[PDB]
Paper text:
The other structure that showed clear features of the bromodomain was determined to 6.9 Å resolution from data collected using a Volta phase plate. Therefore, we used the 4.3 Å resolution structure of apo-Abo1 for comparing with ATP- or ADP- bound states, and referred to the lower resolution structure of apo-Abo1 for describing the bromodomain. Especially in the low resolution cryo-EM structure of the apo-state, six lobes of density that match the expected dimensions of a bromodomain were arranged in a hexameric ring around a central lobe of density. On the outer face of the bromodomain ring, characteristic helical densities that run diagonal to the central ring axis could be observed. In most asymmetric states, only one blade disappeared from the field of view, but there were also rare transient cases where two blades of the ring disappeared simultaneously. These HS-AFM results were highly consistent with our cryo-EM structures that show a closed symmetric ring for apo- and ADP states and an open spiral in the ATP-state. The “hole” is formed by the AAA1 HBD, AAA2 HBD, and a linker that proceeds the AAA2 HBD. This unique addition, which we name the “linker arm”, stabilizes the hexameric conformation and explains how Abo1, in contrast to other AAA+ ATPases, can exist as a stable hexamer even in the absence of nucleotide.
We solve the cryo-EM structures of Abo1 in three different nucleotide states (apo, ADP, and ATP), revealing a major reorganization of the AAA+ domains from an open spiral to a closed ring—a structural change that can also be recapitulated in real time by high-speed atomic force microscopy (HS-AFM).
Residue numbers in the entry:
A (entry chain C), B (entry chain B): 256 to 773, 1128 to 1186
The structure:
């Protein structure tokens, strides 16, 4: 009855070997080469901040590394600390707890130490009533470079938020680094979805993956484990309805489970990923039906951003030092490389002109969706007026101060037209100054889009870009894209009562008690739908889509169709008003 | 002398077997199939959040499940934890309490654990002065997936509000799920009203139910127990007036109680349901007298919403997997089903035009009343200006952020005409953006109604719908509906002094001391009432209703009526000014 899963040695963060290699350079090295500790008498960097969003976990990775070092280091011992249980009313009780763990690691052979919950065991000094915080932070710092060196042991602070630490722990000398976990996206997603399927001795459908790792996103690894559990008991139900309606404890035939794709989709629908438990994510891929009316522009637009932002991937420095040249002993050769990607851009800013309901923010979530691993936020009023305890312009500086953090980062505003009427003049001037407060040498997108087409844009829009390459113009969808948009429906109508689960009354199930021990009628409508919409906005096709879907939801059990079109065309007629 | 009631094994949440089955899949399974714990070596989901409004209870359901597992599992033991008594000044006292319960469940056979009051025993870390919260939350999380697995025991957090937990408990790995209790409405209401009548060995009138479960709504189960108690002692009084005016302790004849419907109605009037102890509920069914003047439109309107919202009931996935097809091993068949109910709607929004006092908000509470189990709130100034510590637009984002929570949900505004003059331009722009901030693929009603008929609507109204199918037009009531409205009164006048309890002087009661051990005169008025109102608003008939009711309240003891009509017609005459 185990709870916890059994994928260890960096098998729970499966799909991400780059940070694995990055860490195996640092904790692994002091115990790899002790000879250079006086041949070159320095401190090889030890101490890792496990950090990242919950759902990835911060602790499963701990025993991940623990198995990545246990047999890798013959031999190394382990010291595990979880939860904020290093307190007391005595300044010396919390003192001696960490001191005891320290010396017992010192009274040990080559060893390592695990700080889960550094935020609780090492919170910020609130020096007004609680000054055991002073003692615990001072002694944890002295265990690194105070009265006690880092020795041949290593410290690993498990962290979930960056606001629960004073700026005395993630500095060099204690950990020297920061480790973030980026939510293995698709095929790293594939490895983390298949590792949990490594548990089924009977063969499970995972070859069909990555058709399951598509929609698995934002769950970390623990929630993917929730996914496999849910699909599991889904298959349980699909096997045995003797679970309910069965009173006495009983038995089975001793080999029972067979998983169905349906069970996977069951588990798929019932739960939600981690970024959105109560906050919607601003990045989401385009729906397939928007594709025949949106990819045409989206390709050009993403091309253009790749132009103004040639960053689209993550460059591994491991592979850089994997391929070196002998033509490097100087800086002017280095000055070549620094010149590029630094002098190659000017102030990435972008806006979109278009009509209301003209695909506005239909691409919005997806353009972030086409590339990740990038610094982001929104200047949207959801977070602008989110702040209550600080002024609105204080919010401005706080978000621009998030961007103060050097990163290829993103300003994100969709349909700014409502914006700049939300805020006072002073907020406008604030944002404008902060834009001027930035240098062209830095690489950060400024992203906006408007429900007002150009030539009528706000006076704050007509100057912030003032260039074709700082703006995208949008038009109406072409007829030929449209007919593809209404393409599938025109045949879904003529295969309904069998291709959809509404033409068939559902199949009854039976299970034993398991004895207990204890056409040409269509083309006119085809011409009808067209030429009644030429000039219609994007949303209006959505309206008609929904309506005709209602029609077919009704006709789901109809046979010999092409007699069911009248409601379609009449809905067309009524729609025009 | 027992307090607590005696309906157990999910007999206190009677009327709701769906969540019963849902939970019996999860806690019941790890102890049902321990063989798949290494044949497939996963953690069957254990840990339930009892959650829902008080009145349903959170704890009676606990022993409900306790009896649904005690004999169902031969054998299982139980560990019950109630109240926030797992604190101390020592970080280790609270530590060892939960640790002791954990191991004693570990030093036990197959067992379960009950967390009542998880909000108190597991509140949020306030990391400024109280950091035993860190210890208790960390150890409760480690009891699941820390130093101690969930084992063969299960955890049940009893919760009353969702704001008393940090986002580290309702995640997968501890409970993995959330359980809400929807207030068994009518016939689930019937089972919960009859289960308390299961206590009377003498036969009680409950066959007349569900004429008692009609008006029982919003009481959960405990308040229905209050209802049966109150009707009980009502029948007590109806039996014995020797309760008062009786000094010495005394005795009876040893079989005494006989319940009357009157006692039920006594209990009915004296108390209030749970949703409204100090907050009125916005959903209430139509009064019967509004029916002859409102059902005609209400039918069409609810039809229309069913069109724009085909959701009207709750689909059980248990029955889905109860009927599966062999024609499912792919996703395009799945893509069929996902296409429907996702692409079948466009942005459910609705408005009503009509006159002041034209039935405005007479249907308002009832249109929610005709269908439940749906996500709701109001944009009414009661909650708009309710907020004091956050800005008004902050309130906007907070409510739109409640809707951020994915649900088939409801925007509710009655008589918006006053609205949009309440708020600044910025609130308007906020709501409008947030409307644009939503995608058509999502299924959420936008609901409004106006005291201004169309063609004179606010400029914010004339565009937010701009379609016949986004709006309902209202007219005056037809004469024939009216005459039915004044139908019953025309005969109530002519059967007064016996059909009503005002023509008879009430009957005296006596009880022994119980010896102690220690016409044609009418039709003119019928034509009078009509043709003096043709064009009159809805409320005006209400006025006349009240007035004539005063008349008859006076004439309650009159005999040989049709001589009492003059006051009626003269009230008509005076009314016109």
């Amino acid at each position: 009855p185990l709870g916890v899963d059994s994928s260890l040695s960096f098998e729970s963060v499966g799909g991400l070997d780059n940070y694995i290699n990055q860490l195996k350079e640092m904790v692994m090295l002091p115990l790899l080469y002790p000879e250079i500790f006086q041949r070159f008498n320095m401190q090889p960097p030890r101490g890792v901040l496990f950090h990242g969003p919950p759902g990835t976990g911060k602790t499963l990775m701990a025993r991940a590394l623990a198995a990545a070092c246990s047999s890798e280091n013959k031999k190394v011992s382990f010291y595990m600390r979880k939860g904020a249980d290093c307190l007391s009313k005595w300044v010396g009780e919390a003192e001696r707890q960490l001191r005891l763990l320290f010396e017992e690691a010192k009274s040990t052979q080559p060893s390592i130490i695990f700080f889960d919950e550094i935020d609780g065991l090492a919170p910020v000094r609130s020096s007004k009533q609680e000054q055991i915080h002073a003692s615990i932070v001072s002694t944890l710092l002295a265990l690194m470079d105070g009265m006690e060196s880092r020795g041949q042991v290593i410290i690993i602070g498990a962290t979930n938020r960056p606001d629960a630490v004073d700026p005395a722990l993630r500095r060099p000398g204690r950990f020297d680094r920061e480790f973030y976990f980026p939510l293995p996206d698709r095929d790293a997603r594939k490895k983390i979805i298949e590792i949990h399927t490594r548990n089924w001795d009977p063969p499970v459908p995972e070859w069909l993956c990555s058709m399951l790792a598509e929609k698995s996103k934002g769950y970390g690894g623990a929630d993917l484990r929730a996914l496999c559990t849910e699909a599991a008991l889904n298959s349980i139900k699909r096997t045995y309805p003797q679970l309910y309606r069965s009173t006495k404890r009983l038995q089975i035939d001793p080999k029972t489970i067979k998983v169905k794709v349906k069970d996977f989709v069951m588990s798929m629908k019932r739960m939600i990923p981690s970024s959105e438990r109560s906050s919607i994510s601003p990045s989401k891929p385009l729906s397939p039906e928007l594709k025949p009316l949106l990819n045409e522009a989206f390709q050009d637009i993403e091309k253009t951003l790749q132009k103004l932002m040639p960053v689209a991937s993550k460059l591994n420095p491991l592979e850089e030092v994997m391929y070196d040249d002998p033509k490097e002993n100087d800086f002017e050769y280095q000055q070549r490389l620094e010149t590029f990607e630094t002098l190659r851009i000017y102030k990435p800013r972008f806006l979109i002109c278009g009509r209301k309901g003209l695909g506005q923010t239909a691409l919005g979530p997806a353009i972030l969706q086409q590339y990740e691993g990038v610094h982001v936020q929104s200047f949207d009023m959801s977070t602008l007026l989110q702040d209550s305890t600080q002024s609105i312009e204080t919010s401005i500086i706080h978000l621009f101060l998030e961007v103060r953090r050097h990163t290829p980062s993103i300003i994100y505003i969709p349909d700014i037209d409502n914006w700049l009427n939300v805020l006072p003049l002073t907020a406008i001037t604030t944002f404008s100054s902060m834009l001027e407060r930035l240098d062209f040498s830095d690489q950060i997108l400024f992203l906006a889009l408007s429900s007002s087409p150009l030539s009528e844009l706000h006076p704050q829009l007509r100057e912030w870009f003032s260039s074709k390459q700082s703006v995208y113009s949008l038009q109406y969808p072409t007829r030929d894209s449209i007919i593809a948009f209404f393409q599938p429906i025109l045949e879904l109508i003529k295969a309904s009562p069998t291709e959809l689960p509404g033409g068939i009354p559902r199949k009854r199930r039976v299970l034993p008690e398991l004895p207990l021990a204890p056409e040409d009628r269509l083309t006119p409508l085809k011409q009808l739908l067209i030429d009644s919409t030429t000039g219609f906005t994007v949303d209006q096709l959505l309206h008609l889509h929904s309506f005709l879907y209602q029609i077919i939801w009704n006709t789901k059990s109809e046979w010999n169709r092409n007699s069911v079109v009248d409601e379609c065309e009449r809905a067309v007629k009524e729609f025009m008003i």
